[PDB]
Amino acid sequence: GASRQRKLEALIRDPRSPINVESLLDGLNSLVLDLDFPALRKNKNIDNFLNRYEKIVKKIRGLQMKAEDYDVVKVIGRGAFGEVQLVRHKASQKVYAMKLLSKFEMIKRSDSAFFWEERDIMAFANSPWVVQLFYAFQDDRYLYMVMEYMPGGDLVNLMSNYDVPEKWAKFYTAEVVLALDAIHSMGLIHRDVKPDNMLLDKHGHLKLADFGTCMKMDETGMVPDYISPEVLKSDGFYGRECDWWSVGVFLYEMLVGDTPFYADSLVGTYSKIMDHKNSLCFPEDAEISKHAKNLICAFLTDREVRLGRNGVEEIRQHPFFKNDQWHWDNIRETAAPVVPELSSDIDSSNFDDIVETFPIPKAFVGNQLPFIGFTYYR
Amino acid sequence: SRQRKLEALIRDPRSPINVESLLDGLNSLVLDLDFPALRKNKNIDNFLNRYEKIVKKIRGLQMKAEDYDVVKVIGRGAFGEVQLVRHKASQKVYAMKLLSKFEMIKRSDSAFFWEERDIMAFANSPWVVQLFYAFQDDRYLYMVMEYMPGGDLVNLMSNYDVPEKWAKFYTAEVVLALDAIHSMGLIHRDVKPDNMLLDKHGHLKLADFGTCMKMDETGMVHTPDYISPEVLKFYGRECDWWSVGVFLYEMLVGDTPFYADSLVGTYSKIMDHKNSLCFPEDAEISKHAKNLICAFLTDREVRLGRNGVEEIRQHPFFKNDQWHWDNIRETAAPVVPELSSDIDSSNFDDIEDVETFPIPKAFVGNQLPFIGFTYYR
Ligand SMILES: COc1cc(C(=O)N[C@H](CO)c2ccccc2)ccc1-c1cn[nH]c1
Ligand SMILES: COc1cc(C(=O)N[C@H](CO)c2ccccc2)ccc1-c1cn[nH]c1
Ligand SMILES: [Cl-]
């Protein structure tokens, strides 16, 4: 009997459950947002429901986390459906990185499901290789993701400010290897491994960000300059090995100073990637070891014989990673090659310097419906 | 903290945003969107796809009509019926009141159940029928109450000639039950013996609160035989005290004080109450009983109970050697029900025995006025 009430009480407590209390409050909020228009309020059912919940929903909005609770310090990133702002929480004075996503642009450009795995990865990974999400909240215009601020900037910035030695390339590669294996363990494929999505923490250690491209792998494990050839030839099924192709490209860019399939045109890069058997060649002036060259070549092969298919053990014991500084079991607790020297809690010097509204409707449209359940409070 | 303030609102059972009300909101949204005409909208089709599984799971876990077994229909009314039911799992017997959502919407009366549910769930008075569970489906609102096997006072009057010692007891119980409702800032507006039930021991409890209204700052607000003249022509608490006088008259005399063959004749007799009220020469009634009926059947301005329940309490009619106002409900009742089983419905007459909602093209929101009805004790 009350075993059913116990089963139900458990679902509502579970933070991964779609019917948790934050997700149930999202349902109420979204229903009020999509009905409070004078055209719709002509309906007696709608006008009377909105009159009943008007007071409580005003009270709830004032209590719940909102963008007004934070001060915007600077825009440190921009992307497809939004921007990432360096913000300071007004009450606690704590500094975070907050990612905003336009609800309007996600509906219009019919791309409105990518944020679910991005939010889940950052909120629940519990890995030092993934940027941690503290709070996810939404208003009538945007989705917000308050994550830990990474003051070391991305690996693109590092490469443009330093001539990268093989000892540093061996460190950042190992960290990318472990970070990807952590994502693959959570049953996901990044699909966009690149140095713009590799951030450095206050101590110079890597963390992955921008999970908008992730996909949960099915039972078989299946789903521009850094894209794999098998992904380019698309619609077909690809696996974890496409993420390791991106690692090969990254290690080449680090040591050589240019991407292996760089071309002046977009089509030229595609052409070079497709012809990877004949287009991949190391410059005669490039400072690279035989082990480093041999590792890049094991990643830049056809998917069938690529390194990393039979797990990450084959990658771990590659001769390139032989060193006298770290082990795979402690690399993140060893001293990083470059440690950030920051002047304040809002020093954003490792980041380069960087609105269409919904139309009032006549009939029920339900623009808030695809966002019910986004709110999360740690 | 703000999160502590918010967590308190959701725990409060009187709060419109409690967990049962928040689950009602989700259920009602799914019910009002799952139509193939509406599902043509991408937002709607995708939302329904996401919550389809979990809402099927939630419905199976939550209390439903299929958890109860219908024993007999013991009452029928305006928008539904009251069924004697037995909970399949616990084997406990209850009285379950059903209200058609369709009829409530159609006959544009869809707010009366909020005070009926609140009165029965939260009164905490032995004079009010207790509600244990309120729940709903796509067709009805359900109210699981304590079953009253003694039947109503109409049934008692039709099976017994009422002596003044019995009339003094039942009146005193109506007086205390009405004072309890008035204490909660409510006016019944429909005091009559059909709405007075007797428990397993013969003690009164009030039922059918569909006519109740919360009184404003001054104590004011906005059935043919028991209606007051002021309602026939803002009304206060003394409006319920009129119905008590009519009740005491029907008990002692055997007929209504303003009974007429026509509805217009009854409406005329009530308006001319100053000259139409007279006690039959063959009626066995004391001077005190006659004088009490007359203090209730006056113009609202000078009616007994206008200046409090203390005035009614001290009336000479209630002088007796059996009970006191502080213990009447723990004294022996005049008629104690003789029941054969937990489902003996012999003190209730037999009840003699299809409109569904139309499938819509656009969002109508027929479930919206019912969000927050679910209550679990
Ligand atoms: C720039 O910093 C970030 C960027 C991102 C991120 O996902 N960026 C992309 C494009 O760069 C994007 C996509 C969609 C909308 C906007 C932005 C995620 C975390 C941080 C971060 C974490 N801690 N500190 C900074
Ligand atoms: C018959 O017993 C009841 C009746 C009612 C009641 O409110 N009845 C009216 C008129 O019939 C009605 C209104 C709307 C729909 C249907 C019926 C309320 C409680 C009981 C009851 C019995 N035991 N415990 C509680
Ligand atoms: Cl090693």
Whole-number Å distance between alpha carbons of B182 and B162 = 27
**Inter-residue contact A111 to A79 (CB < 8 Å):** no
Residue with tokens 């890049």: A296
Residue type for A146, please?
A: V
Phi, psi of A99, deg, nearest 5: -95, 125
d(CA B235, CA B221): 5
Q: Residue B327, SS3? A: coil
Using H for helix, E for strand and C for coil, what is the string for B65-133? HHHEEEEEEEEECCCEEEEEEEECCCCCEEEEEEEEHHHHHHCCCCCHHHHHHHHHHHCCCCCECCEEE
Put simply, the answer to whether A63 touches B365 (Cβ < 8 Å) is no
B188 is written with which tokens? 């019944």
- Tell me the residue type at B245: G
**Which residues of A are known to be catalytic?**
192
Angle at B55 between CA B34 and CA A25, to 5 degrees: 95
- Nearest ligand, CA of residue B80? 2
- State the first-to-last Cα distance of chain A, in angstroms, to the nearest integer: 33
What are the two backbone dihedrals, phi and then psi, of residue A2, each rounded to the nearest 5 degrees? -65, 0
Q: Is B236 helix (H, G, I), strand (E, B) or coil?
A: coil
Element (H, E) at B292: helix B287-296
Contact A125, A367 (CB under 8 A): no
What Rg, from alpha-carbon coordinates, does chain B have? 24
Query: By C-alpha distance, which of A154, A143, A149, A148 is closest to A114?
Result: A143
In whole angstroms, give the CA distance from residue A279 to residue A230: 16
Which of A122, A210, A351, A354 best tests ligand 1's pocket when mutated (most atoms within 8 Å of CB)? A210
- Nearest-angstrom CA–CA distance, A207 and A154: 9
Ligand 1 centroid vs A164 CA: distance in angstroms? Answer: 24
Burial A188-208 (b: 16+ CB within 10 A, else e): bbbbbbbbebbbbbeebbbbb
What DSSP element (H or E) covers B34?
A: none
Q: How far is the CA of A305 from the centre of ligand 2 (A)?
A: 77
| Pocket residue to mutate for ligand 2, from B208, B209, B342, B345, most atoms within 8 A of Cβ | B208
Resolution value (Å, 1 decimal): 2.6
Asked if B366 lies within 8 A of A45 by C-beta distance, the reply is yes
- Ligand 1 centre from A29 Cα, in Å? 27
Interchain CB distance below 8 Å, A18 and B54? yes
Q: How far is Cα A227 from Cα A114, in angstroms, rounded to an integer?
A: 19
Residues of chain A found within 8 Å of residue B5, distances taken between Cβ atoms: 63
Q: How far is CA B43 from CA A283, A330, A367, B31, in A?
A: 52, 47, 7, 15
- Smallest CA-to-CA distance from B90 within B111, B110, B69 is with B69
- In B151-181, which positions are buried (b, 16+ CB within 10 angstroms) versus exposed (e)? bbbebbbeeeebebebbbbbbbbbbbbbbbb
Asked whether B110 and B99 are in contact (CB, 8 A), the reply is no
What tokens appear for B224 in the block?
Answer: 């043919």
- How far, in Å, CA of A91 to CA of A85, rounded? 18
Q: What's the CA gap between A265 and A49, in Å, rounded?
A: 57
Instruction: Give the C-alpha distances (Å, rounded to integers) separating B132 from A308, B11, B58, B63, B128.
Output: 61, 18, 20, 12, 12
3-state secondary structure of B321: coil
**Using H for helix, E for strand and C for coil, what is the string for chain A?**
CHHHHHHHHHHHHCCCCCCCHHHHHHHHHHHHHCCCCCCHHHCHHHHHHHHHHHHHHHHHHHHCCCHHHEEEEEEEEECCCEEEEEEEECCCCCEEEEEEEEHHHHHHCCCCCHHHHHHHHHHHCCCCCECCEEEEEECCCEEEEEEECCCCCEHHHHHHHCCCCHHHHHHHHHHHHHHHHHHHHCCEECCCCCHHHEEECCCCCEEECCCCCCEECCCCCCCCCCCCHHHHCCCCCCCCHHHHHHHHHHHHHHHHCCCCCCCCCHHHHHHHHHCHHHHCCCCCCCCCCHHHHHHHHHHCCCHHHCCCCCCCHHHHCCHHHCCCCCCCCCHHHCCCCCCCCCCCCCCCCCCCCCCCCCCCCCCCCCCCHHHCCCCEEC
**Distance of alpha carbon B209 from alpha carbon B221, whole angstroms:** 15
**Alpha-carbon dihedral angle through residues A125, A131, A136, A141, given to the nearest 10 degrees:** -130
Place of tokens 């419906």: A369
A268 is in an annotated binding site: no
Rounded Cα gap, residues A32 and A51, in angstroms? 10
DSSP label at residue B254: S
Q: B190: Cβ below 6 Å to ligand 2?
A: no
- For chain A, how many residues are written? 378
Query: What is the DSSP track for B196-222?
Result: EEE-TTS-EEE---TT-EE--TTS---
For residue B172, how many C-alpha atoms fall within 13 Å in the half-sphere facing its CB?
A: 26
Helix (H) or strand (E) holding B135: strand B131-136
Q: Rounded CA gap, B46 and A370, in Å?
A: 7
Quick one: closest CA in B to A367, which residue? B43
d(CA A46, CA A29): 14
Strand partners, A188: A216
CA of residue A258 relative to chain centroid, distance:
24
User: In whole angstroms, what is the distance from residue A192 CA to residue A249 CA?
Assistant: 12
Is A326 exposed, middle or buried, given 0-12, 13-18 or 19+ CB atoms closer than 10 A? middle
Residue B148 structure tokens: 């009253």
Nearest-by-Cβ selection for A7 from B23, B33, B61 = B61
Residues of B in contact with A45 (CB under 8 A): 105, 364-366, 368-369
Ligand 3 centroid distance, CA of A166 (Å): 15
**Which one of A14, A16, A17, A19 would you mutate to disrupt binding with B, by most B Cβ within 10 Å of its Cβ?**
A19
Question: Rounded CA gap, A367 and A364, in Å?
Answer: 9
- Do residues A332 and A326 touch, judged by C-beta distance below 8 A? no
Mutate to test the interface with B, among A4, A28, A109, A137 (most CBs of B within 10 A): A28
B250 marked as binding residue: no
Closest by Cα among B177, B155, B160 to B345: B155
Closest CA to A293 of A281, A279, A311, A307: A281
Closest to A289 (Cα-Cα) out of A331, A322, A317, A334: A322
CA distance B46 to A369: 9
* Amino acid of residue B187: I
What DSSP designation does B302 have? Answer: G
Active site annotation includes B190: yes
Residue B376 has which token pair? 């679990």
Nearest to B17 among A4, A19, A60 (CB): A60
Q: Cα separations (Å) of A142 from A3, A16, A102, B152?
A: 40, 22, 5, 59
Q: Is the minimum distance from the CB of B145 to ligand 2 under 6 angstroms?
A: yes
Residues from chain B contacting residue A369 (CB–CB below 8 Å): 43-44, 46-47
Way the structure was solved: X-ray
Contact criterion met (CB below 8 Å) for A176 and A130: no
B75 is in an annotated binding site: yes
CA-closest residue to ligand 2 atom 24: B147
A19, A48, A363: residue with CB nearest B26: A19
Residue A210 phi/psi, 5-degree rounding, is 60, 70
Angle made by CA atoms B101, B106, B112, in degrees to the nearest 5: 60
Phi and psi torsions of B365, nearest 5° = 70, 50
CB A350 within 8 A of CB A157: yes
Interface of A with B (CB under 8 A): 1, 4-5, 7-8, 11-12, 17-19, 21, 24-25, 27-28, 31, 35, 43-46, 48-49, 52-53, 56, 59-60, 63-64, 107, 110, 112, 363-367, 369-370, 372, 377
As to burial, measured by CB atoms within 10 angstroms (0-12 exposed, 13-18 middle, 19+ buried), residue A337 is middle
Whether the CB-CB separation of A96 and A148 falls below 8 Å is answered with yes
For β-strands A133-138 and A142-148, DSSP reports them as antiparallel
User: Exposed, middle or buried: residue B114 (CB in 10 Å: 0-12, 13-18, 19+)?
Assistant: middle
d(CA B215, CA B240): 13
> In chain A, what are the domain boundaries?
1-153+342-378, 154-341
Find the B197 Cα to ligand 2 centroid distance in Å.
Answer: 10
d(CA A104, CA A113): 14
A58 vs chain B: nearest CA distance in angstroms?
A: 12
What is the CB-side half-sphere exposure of residue B162 using CA atoms within 13 A? 24
Radius of gyration (Cα) for chain A, nearest Å? Answer: 24
Element (H, E) at B164: helix B164-183
**For residues B174 and B247, what is the distance between their CA atoms, to the nearest angstrom?**
9
User: What one-letter code names the amino acid at A262?
Assistant: Y
Question: In the 8-state DSSP scheme, what is residue B165?
Answer: H
